[PDB]
Amino acid sequence: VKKFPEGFLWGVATASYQIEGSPLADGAGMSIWHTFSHTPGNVKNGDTGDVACDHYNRWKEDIEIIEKLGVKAYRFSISWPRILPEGTGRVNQKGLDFYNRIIDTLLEKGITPFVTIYHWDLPFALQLKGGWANREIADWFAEYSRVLFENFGDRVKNWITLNEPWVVAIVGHLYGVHAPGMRDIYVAFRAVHNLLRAHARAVKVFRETVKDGKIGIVFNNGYFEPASEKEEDIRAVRFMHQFNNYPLFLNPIYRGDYPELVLEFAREYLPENYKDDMSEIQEKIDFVGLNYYSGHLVKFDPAKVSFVERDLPKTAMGWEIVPEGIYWILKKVKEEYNPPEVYITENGAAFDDVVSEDGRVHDQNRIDYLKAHIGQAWKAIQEGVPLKGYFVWSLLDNFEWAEGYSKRFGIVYVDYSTQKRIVKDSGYWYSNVVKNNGLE
Numbered sequence: 001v002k003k004f005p006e007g008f009l010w011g012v013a014t015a016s017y018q019i020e021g022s023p024l025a026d027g028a029g030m031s032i033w034h035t036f037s038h039t040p041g042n043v044k045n046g047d048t049g050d051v052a053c054d055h056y057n058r059w060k061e062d063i064e065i066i067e068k069l070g071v072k073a074y075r076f077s078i079s080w081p082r083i084l085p086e087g088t089g090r091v092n093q094k095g096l097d098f099y100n101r102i103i104d105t106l107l108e109k110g111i112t113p114f115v116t117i118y119h120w121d122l123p124f125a126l127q128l129k130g131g132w133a134n135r136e137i138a139d140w141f142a143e144y145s146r147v148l149f150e151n152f153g154d155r156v157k158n159w160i161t162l163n164e165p166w167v168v169a170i171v172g173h174l175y176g177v178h179a180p181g182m183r184d185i186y187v188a189f190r191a192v193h194n195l196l197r198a199h200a201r202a203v204k205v206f207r208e209t210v211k212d213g214k215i216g217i218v219f220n221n222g223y224f225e226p227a228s229e230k231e232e233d234i235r236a237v238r239f240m241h242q243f244n245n246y247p248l249f250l251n252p253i254y255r256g257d258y259p260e261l262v263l264e265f266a267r268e269y270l271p272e273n274y275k276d277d278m279s280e281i282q283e284k285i286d287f288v289g290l291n292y293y294s295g296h297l298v299k300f301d302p303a304k305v306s307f308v309e310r311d312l313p314k315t316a317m318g319w320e321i322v323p324e325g326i327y328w329i330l331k332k333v334k335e336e337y338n339p340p341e342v343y344i345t346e347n348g349a350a351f352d353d354v355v356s357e358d359g360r361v362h363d364q365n366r367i368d369y370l371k372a373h374i375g376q377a378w379k380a381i382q383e384g385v386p387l388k389g390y391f392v393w394s395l396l397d398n399f400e401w402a403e404g405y406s407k408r409f410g411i412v413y414v415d416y417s418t419q420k421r422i423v424k425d426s427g428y429w430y431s432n433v434v435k436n437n438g439l440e
């Protein structure tokens with residue numbers, strides 16, 4: 001028996017562009033994921049978010065699935081361009097109505113809404129004006145956030161400004177693998193910095209608008225272990241943590257500067273007077289959300305870092321399964337920054353799910369993955385990490401960004417030819433976990 005604290009939030013998580021479809025319904029503006037995925041060569045099999053899980057029409061059934069499973073919290077995101085089609089100025093009432101109906105239904109059913117304000121679908125109109133590269137995004141984001149607060153802050157009390165700003169900046173603007181598909185290191189670090197200033201401006205508006213809520217920010221994290229005992233391999237791991245994990249953003253937020261190994265690699269790429277923005281960036285936040293999935297063996301390599309293949313079980317993504325990582329990153333966040341609250345805002349796995357003659361989905365692979373990680377998060381709670389909740393990625397199989405529909409992360413199976421949902425063995429298993437408030 002590994003029982004969790006009283007009132008611990010068991011959740012599932014999604015994102016707007018990944019599940020909704022109908023990206024241009026009811027007056028919505030185009031997002032950068034619409035235009036990116038409609039550009040040939042950008043996404044596996046030419047997949048797009050045009051239909052996805054059709055959650056835009058099937059939202060009530062999906063929520064009834066959450067209810068039926070006894071899951072207590074739902075993390076979902078809001079499509080910025082459904083709300084403000086040109087990014088700023090005009091507010092689309094039908095976009096608001098979409099999420100209002102979802103919010104009210106959740107509350108009526110006793111499910112707690114966790115709203116991610118930004119999960120990667122920037123209005124195309126703002127990308128034309130530079131997107132995250134443009135300092136003015138701090139204002140655009142603040143105005144968008146304000147609209148959300150004033151419309152939903154009466155019911156939604158748990159808010160996340162940004163999902164994984166490292167991904168948004170680096171993967172979108174350095175690697176060119178995600179929208180807007182750019183490859184410029186100077187742009188990428190100007191996006192890092194602007195994402196911090198936009199987050200902080202949104203927290204500032206939140207304090208003025210929603211006197212009773214809590215607001216945080218979510219980061220992607222990996223468990224980096226060194227390839228050897230050498231100083232250089234250990235330092236490589238020190239860099240990877242500071243750059244890829246929560247320190248890139250939490251050091252500015254809590255300590256007022258970037259981490260030192262980030263400045264050694266990247267100072268030339270940041271704005272010259274970037275320090276002028278640091279005091280505003282230190283705006284107080286209520287919680288840290290950490291996403292965690294995999295570990296990496298790492299060595300210095302004359303980036304100056306490469307990864308080392310390890311045997312280890314991998315998921316269908318080719319990601320090594322390292323459950324002790326989730327315990328480590330939870331310990332390390334307390335040790336380094338001691339935020340008053342942490343949530344695991346995403347944890348999950350992609351496996352090659354098949355519907356058996358059954359037709360059940362016997363994803364014992366995913367049960368083992370989840371169980372293992374839930375166990376390590378228990379451990380962290382026993383050693384005093386203020387972990388208040390845990391969210392499975394994902395409720396549904398969905399559009400997995402540049403992988404398209406070929407990667408299935410759901411605890412609910414989606415048959416794309418019909419839109420039939422089939423609860424996986426992992427979903428039933430997780431329901432039992434929530435009911436008992438822990439493992440057995």
Ligand SMILES: OC[C@@H]1[C@@H](O)[C@H](O)[C@@H](O)c2[nH]cc[n+]21
Nearest residue numbers: 015163164220291393400409
């Ligand atoms: O790759 C599975 C998922 C994506 O679908 C989510 O949008 C994203 O927030 C995330 N971070 C780490 C892994 N994932």
